[PDB]
Design an enzyme around this catalytic site. Structure first.
Site, mmCIF file in Angstrom:
data_model
loop_
_atom_site.group_PDB
_atom_site.id
_atom_site.type_symbol
_atom_site.label_atom_id
_atom_site.label_comp_id
_atom_site.label_asym_id
_atom_site.label_seq_id
_atom_site.Cartn_x
_atom_site.Cartn_y
_atom_site.Cartn_z
ATOM 1 N N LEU A 136 -6.553 0.095 -4.332
ATOM 2 C CA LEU A 136 -5.503 1.061 -4.627
ATOM 3 C C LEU A 136 -4.108 0.429 -4.637
ATOM 4 O O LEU A 136 -3.110 1.150 -4.520
ATOM 5 C CB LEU A 136 -5.543 2.208 -3.610
ATOM 6 C CG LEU A 136 -6.812 3.048 -3.427
ATOM 7 C CD1 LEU A 136 -8.021 2.230 -3.013
ATOM 8 C CD2 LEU A 136 -6.548 4.139 -2.386
ATOM 9 N N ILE A 196 0.623 6.825 0.132
ATOM 10 C CA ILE A 196 -0.003 5.804 0.960
ATOM 11 C C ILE A 196 -1.453 5.639 0.536
ATOM 12 O O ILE A 196 -2.121 6.597 0.141
ATOM 13 C CB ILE A 196 0.067 6.159 2.461
ATOM 14 C CG1 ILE A 196 1.497 6.505 2.871
ATOM 15 C CG2 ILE A 196 -0.447 5.001 3.302
ATOM 16 C CD1 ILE A 196 1.591 7.203 4.213
ATOM 17 N N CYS A 197 -1.945 4.404 0.635
ATOM 18 C CA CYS A 197 -3.347 4.076 0.399
ATOM 19 C C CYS A 197 -3.987 3.758 1.745
ATOM 20 O O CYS A 197 -3.750 2.684 2.311
ATOM 21 C CB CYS A 197 -3.473 2.901 -0.565
ATOM 22 S SG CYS A 197 -2.552 3.129 -2.099
ATOM 23 N N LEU A 198 -4.790 4.689 2.257
ATOM 24 C CA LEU A 198 -5.467 4.517 3.536
ATOM 25 C C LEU A 198 -6.909 4.976 3.402
ATOM 26 O O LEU A 198 -7.172 6.058 2.870
ATOM 27 C CB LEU A 198 -4.765 5.306 4.646
ATOM 28 C CG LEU A 198 -3.642 4.588 5.391
ATOM 29 C CD1 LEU A 198 -2.846 5.579 6.216
ATOM 30 C CD2 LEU A 198 -4.198 3.488 6.283
ATOM 31 N N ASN A 255 0.802 -1.217 0.000
ATOM 32 C CA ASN A 255 0.000 0.000 0.000
ATOM 33 C C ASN A 255 0.838 1.272 0.000
ATOM 34 O O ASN A 255 0.293 2.358 0.218
ATOM 35 C CB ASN A 255 -0.936 0.008 1.212
ATOM 36 C CG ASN A 255 -1.756 -1.257 1.320
ATOM 37 O OD1 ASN A 255 -1.598 -2.033 2.263
ATOM 38 N ND2 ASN A 255 -2.640 -1.475 0.352
#
Lengths: 152, 994, 151
Positions: C121, C86-88, C79
């Site tokens: 993502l 970042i993918c959050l 991620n």
């Protein structure tokens, strides 16, 4: 991550003697560390169990980005090994990464002699024989092992 | 002649933009206001790209100070209008683009005749707001850009209606389906990732069961996993059986832009650097205040390094934030240090910041003509302050920074005379003379880099100029085709800045182990740094390693269409270029290539081998057979395909043609063998109805069941297989006709083929004994030898791509794969890299901004930047270089990339071995020189006798039976080792000084 | 003075008053918006050996707009991409004005301990994490030693 590709070979060669792969020998030429001489014992309870099979292995310029080239030197009756010794292996083309080793390639060929896949064939004549006439295909494999794969 | 593109000139740019974007560009008339440095860097890129017309406007006279970034101005032109003198030089860049001068801009309605208007720093804001207003209401696209020393901005306004047709330019994603559930969930075959995103659109084909799903209808994608997505309920369409290929489709997106007047007060920012998000609203007020300053001061910008003018500009910027409170927000005060720096550098004119915006803006000019890629929306601000040197060494004040009556006065205005002198006296090595190499040289020519007494440039490139180079390598003209890049490019930049006349050493040599006599120890030691302008990774990985060995900085750079990147390699500090690069694209499986293609990439790679088999390798075997005494008995124990080699020779004597008609026959017979017989044989082993073990169909998933081909001379791909086949064969044997007679004519090839007997197919030591015996003696075959073909992809007359595309497509017809044309086949088989001048120019700007930091010997890693850019989005990223990872043996710490062991003298092996033990506590287990293992601990005791008492040079000869040459002064060695506990340890390499 | 600096002030004062286990978070003396963060690699993850540095920016419309955040340390993670992005979920889909920068930091700490390579993502190191999990963790442990600082 990285290192020079003689240093890489050096490290892999040292571990191939430090602990070898059961049934396989693999030694490079002191003249050319790219070229290896390999021999593989035929796996147990396979049509190849009686003989020894010799291979040539070359590490290309951009190894381990590029995968090792391999050629069977021994004549063999196998769906994935053609008249010229060329091999079909996923790890060589599609599933290759820099993290893998020569050790990985050799174990994959050993696993392939024990378990052919004629559903993705290279030697088409012998694959349809393996599909449609399995017991007879293994008979011809056991025969060619006795004729062409020396002994032991 | 509307609708024609010169595919040889635009070849590489045509793979970036494509046909429709470029047919629209040639429909566009573009105007550029202000022809100082930034002006030309746009016009140059826009003219090279190819618009309908370029019109320029700058009726103000040339001063010496303009040459700081106007590469098209010399000291000859001083006192003359910049538009006039510059316009004759742009005219040379592209014959297909007229270049005109606007003599007066007395009225704003003169703008009606243009589709795009580009206003630069020479235009004041009152005029920019008025021009923009006329453009917005009239439907004319407006762009503007300013650079103030190490600062810059750009603005884009395309009106209330602008439709993006392709937002990325990526070749559309496509993949094979294995299951489509009634709810719409689509699973991928053999667990390959679709590479899609939420909001994409796909069309399907070949999906048995859900019949209407394949009619071209689009389907919006919701991504489930990396291997699955959903498209919505498919119950109505039926129920899934098997098969399927989804194909991503790009749908138009409408967008609207706000006018400049609107955006000055409520701006929409596109950011360039993550760690400078705040500076955008600050420089938005600043760049405005500069214009307000100039209207207060008879048109003048702030005095350089003046605190009175900067203190006012702060004041002016404060009043604006009261007038435009949206910009900064709330709680955000004015950054007075950043506005003082803006005021200090207003006069500043920096090459690197110009080439950067020159490309960025020019690319947006191109987006405006075509609708290809996603435009900027709408402001972007940028600065490279960390290029500034340490003021402890190179202080900046009103004296050190004053003009000296030279072309560099505007660079001296930013950096000061001392630093500018230090640049001039630097010693550089440029590897490559292409698009990047060219822009590099032109930047260094503007900087004066290398013009100093003890400075010089060395540029090398073994390649010569060809037509498609001219699309992005702007130092070359048509008459220079067939000449050597580096030599002509060296001349070119001296004409720009005669201060370099005699200081560039243009060489023609490749950079490998074979040219280390020319590029020897003394060469590398004298350099200050190295710059890479090369494409292919093997030469770059070599140069990268020479730099590690000699501990020289290296500036790497690269573009892939609209994508670009920069990398700084710093001794004792950062990684190297080889340290971390991503792996290549996977190779095509042999079984897939040989028997089971399902994708035109497979057929093209098969046709390329076949081209090499017929017309290159066959003729090499035959010519060795006819010349080398022992080639016959050599083959019997040397080659792998002994059968095929002898066959090839035999066939070359059986089928020896005598007229062009025999070649046509040969080609038609090869058609049958390759596209008729071999398929029938394949189907004989594995019929369409074949079952596997387990008992599921053999032709399923990634497999397509072929059909044999009935020859048809009216099928374009059949006709051209025999034409190119006939002509390539004729070349081997020196036969008359060929394509220099006329254009190929189906009817006359038909007469030959119609009277041929063609064989029906039948399901198919002593083999070789025949071949060997059935070959005559060479002496018999007097006066005769084949001429092998040398695959060149960029000569259109030579039939090479004609054969590969026809051969590829004929095989595509077997396996029911959609045929491709020459430009696409030329892209995959040529392994061509898309390239446009916009990215090239831009990336080169960033690299020269990082060069200043080298000249100041910056040791702080956080000062440097590695850039990524995707001008299609557009996106600008800047990261900190990756620190060289550190190793450790025996408590002693070392740099895994830069440190090594150094041993003077030709040392005895056992001396080296005990030397390491008694010094480093290390136990050498392995030791190599190059590709030769000189020592290993698993060697037999008798092997170790030979070697242990030998100096390393004799040891090298023992193993390789060939000795080091005299010019060699050093030797690198690689080693494995164990520490005091006998545990293994990673350790650096060894240098031997002979 | 104004709302948003007072918000930051209060959040910063609580990050001092009660810090988050394993995490450093301090704003620049230049710019109250920018934060320098460090995160210890969670125990019994492939990152347990190292320290990872991040930069965090609070935009104009915070807390309607979520914090922008960027890994400064090189990491092998499904991620986290090559540029530190970042993918959050909390950053895009699950962001509300009620959440804090404390919330963001705990989410990244939870993510280093538990990657999700099945998230939409994701990257291509994700298919390595799916196909070759043990080898993916091997490369993560290696990169932690090569690029993440010691402790």
């Amino acid at each position: 991550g990285m290192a020079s590709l003689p240093k890489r070979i050096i490290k892999e060669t040292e571990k191939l003697v430090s602990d070898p792969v059961p049934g396989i020998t693999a030694e490079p030429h002191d003249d050319n560390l790219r070229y290896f001489q390999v021999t593989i014992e035929g796996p147990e309870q396979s049509p190849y169990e009686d003989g020894i099979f010799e291979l040539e292995l070359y590490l290309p310029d951009d190894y381990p980005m590029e995968a090792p080239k391999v050629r069977f030197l021994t004549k063999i009756y196998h769906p994935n090994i053609d008249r010229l010794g060329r091999i079909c292996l996923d790890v060589l083309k599609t599933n290759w990464s820099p993290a893998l080793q020569i050790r990985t390639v050799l174990l994959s060929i050993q696993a392939l002699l024990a378990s052919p896949n004629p559903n993705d064939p290279l030697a088409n004549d012998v694959a349809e024989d393996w599909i449609k006439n399995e017991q007879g295909a293994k008979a011809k494999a056991r025969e060619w092992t006795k004729l062409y794969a020396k002994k032991k | 002649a509307a609708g024609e593109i010169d595919e040889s000139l635009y070849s590489r740019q045509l793979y970036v933009l494509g046909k429709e974007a470029m047919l629209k560009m040639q429909t566009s008339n573009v105007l550029i206001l202000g022809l100082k440095g930034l002006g030309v860097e746009i016009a140059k890129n826009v003219v090279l790209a190819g618009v309908k017309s370029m019109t320029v406007f700058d009726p103000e006279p040339v001063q010496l100070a303009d040459l700081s970034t106007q590469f098209f101005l010399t000291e000859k032109d001083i006192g003359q209008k910049r538009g006039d003198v510059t316009r004759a030089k742009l005219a040379e860049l592209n014959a297909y683009v007229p270049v005109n001068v606007l003599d007066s801009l007395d009225d704003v309605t003169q703008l009606s005749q243009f589709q795009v208007v580009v206003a630069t720093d020479t235009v004041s804001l009152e005029d920019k707001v008025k021009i923009n207003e006329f453009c917005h209401s009239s439907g004319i696209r407006f762009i503007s850009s300013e650079t103030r020393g190490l600062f810059g901005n750009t603005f884009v306004d395309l009106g209330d209606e602008f439709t993006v047709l392709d937002p990325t330019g990526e070749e559309p994603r496509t993949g094979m389906v294995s299951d489509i559930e009634p709810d719409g969930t689509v699973t991928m075959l053999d667990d390959n990732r679709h590479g899609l995103e939420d909001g994409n659109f796909v069309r399907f084909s070949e999906v048995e069961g859900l019949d209407k799903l394949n009619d071209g209808t689009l389907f919006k994608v919701e991504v489930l996993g990396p291997f699955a997505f959903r498209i919505g309920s498919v119950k109505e369409y039926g129920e899934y059986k098997k098969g399927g290929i989804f194909t991503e489709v790009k749908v138009p997106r409408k967008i609207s832009f706000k006018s400049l007047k609107q955006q000055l007060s409520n701006p929409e920012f596109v950011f360039s650097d993550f760690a400078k998000f705040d500076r955008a609203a600050q420089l938005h007020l600043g760049f405005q205040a500069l214009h307000q300053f100039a209207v207060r001061h008879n048109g003048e910008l702030p005095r350089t390094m003046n605190d009175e003018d900067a203190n006012e500009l702060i004041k002016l910027v404060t009043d604006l934030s009261v007038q435009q409170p949206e910009v900064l927000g709330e709680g955000v005060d004015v950054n007075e240090d950043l506005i003082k720096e803006l005021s200090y550098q207003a006069r500043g004119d920096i090459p690197g910041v110009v080439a950067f915006f020159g490309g960025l803006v020019a690319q947006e000019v191109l987006k405006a003509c075509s609708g290809k890629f996603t435009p900027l929306k709408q402001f972007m601000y940028f600065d490279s302050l960390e290029s500034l040197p340490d003021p402890k060494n190179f202080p900046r004040n009103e004296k050190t920074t004053q003009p000296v009556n030279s072309r560099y006065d505007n660079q001296i205005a930013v950096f000061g005379l001392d630093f500018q002198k230090k640049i001039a006296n630097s010693k550089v090595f440029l590897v490559g003379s292409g698009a990047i190499g060219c822009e590099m040289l032109k930047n260094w020519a503007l900087l004066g880099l290398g013009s100093g007494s003890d400075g010089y440039i060395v540029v090398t490139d073994n390649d010569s100029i060809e037509k498609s180079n001219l699309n992005r390598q702007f130092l070359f003209r048509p008459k220079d085709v067939g000449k050597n890049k580096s030599e002509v490019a060296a001349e070119a930049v001296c004409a720009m800045n005669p201060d370099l006349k005699g200081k560039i050493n243009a060489k023609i040599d490749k950079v490998g182990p074979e040219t280390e006599e020319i590029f020897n120890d003394s060469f590398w030691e004298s350099l200050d740094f190295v710059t890479n302008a090369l494409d292919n990774v093997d030469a770059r990985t070599y140069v990268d390693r020479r730099c590690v060995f000699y501990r020289k900085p290296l500036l790497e750079s690269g573009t892939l269409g609209t994508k670009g990147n920069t990398q700084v390699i710093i001794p004792r500090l950062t990684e190297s270029y080889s340290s971390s690069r991503d792996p290549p694209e996977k190779s095509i499986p042999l079984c897939t290539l040989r028997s089971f293609p399902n994708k035109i990439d497979h057929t093209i790679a098969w046709a390329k081998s076949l081209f090499q088999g017929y017309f290159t390798d066959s003729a090499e075997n035959v010519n060795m057979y006819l010349t080398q005494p022992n080639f016959v008995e050599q083959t019997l124990k040397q080659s792998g395909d002994v059968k095929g080699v002898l066959e090839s020779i035999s066939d070359s004597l059986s089928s020896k043609p005598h007229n062009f008609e025999d070649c046509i026959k040969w080609a038609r017979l090869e058609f049958e063998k390759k596209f008729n017989h071999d398929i029938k044989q394949l189907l004989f082993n594995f019929p369409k109805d074949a079952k596997t073990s387990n008992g599921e169909p053999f032709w399923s998933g990634a497999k397509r069941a072929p059909t044999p081909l009935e020859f048809d001379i009216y099928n374009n791909d059949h006709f051209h297989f025999v034409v190119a086949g006939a002509s390539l064969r004729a070349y081997n044997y020196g036969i008359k006709s060929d394509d220099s007679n006329s254009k190929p004519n189906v009817d006359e090839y038909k007469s030959v083929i119609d009277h041929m007997i063609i064989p029906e197919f039948t399901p198919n030591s002593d083999e070789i004994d025949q071949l060997v015996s059935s070959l005559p003696d060479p002496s018999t075959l007097a006066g005769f030898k084949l001429e092998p073909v040398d695959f060149e992809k960029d000569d259109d007359t030579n039939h090479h791509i004609e054969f590969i595309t026809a051969c590829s497509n004929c095989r595509a017809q077997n396996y029911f794969i959609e045929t491709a044309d020459r430009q696409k086949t030329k892209f995959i088989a040529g392994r061509i890299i898309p390239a446009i001048a916009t990215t090239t120019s831009l990336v080169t700007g960033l690299v020269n901004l990082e060069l200043y930091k080298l000249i100041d010997n910056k040791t702080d890693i956080e000062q440097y930047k590695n850039g990524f850019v995707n001008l299609a989005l557009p996106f600008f990223g800047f990261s900190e270089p990756i620190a060289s990872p550190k190793g450790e043996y025996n408590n002693k710490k070392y740099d895994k990339i830069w440190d090594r062991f150094d041993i003077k003298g030709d040392i005895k092996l056992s001396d080296l071995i005990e030397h390491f033990e008694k010094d480093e506590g290390l136990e050498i287990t392995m030791l190599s020189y190059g590709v030769s293992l000189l020592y290993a601990s698993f060697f037999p005791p008798k092997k170790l006798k030979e070697r242990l008492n030998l100096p390393i040079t004799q040891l090298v000869k023992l193993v390789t039976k060939k000795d080091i040459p005299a010019h060699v002064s050093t030797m690198i060695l690689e080693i494995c080792a164990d520490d005091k506990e006998g545990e293994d340890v990673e350790v650096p390499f060894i240098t031997i000084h002979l």
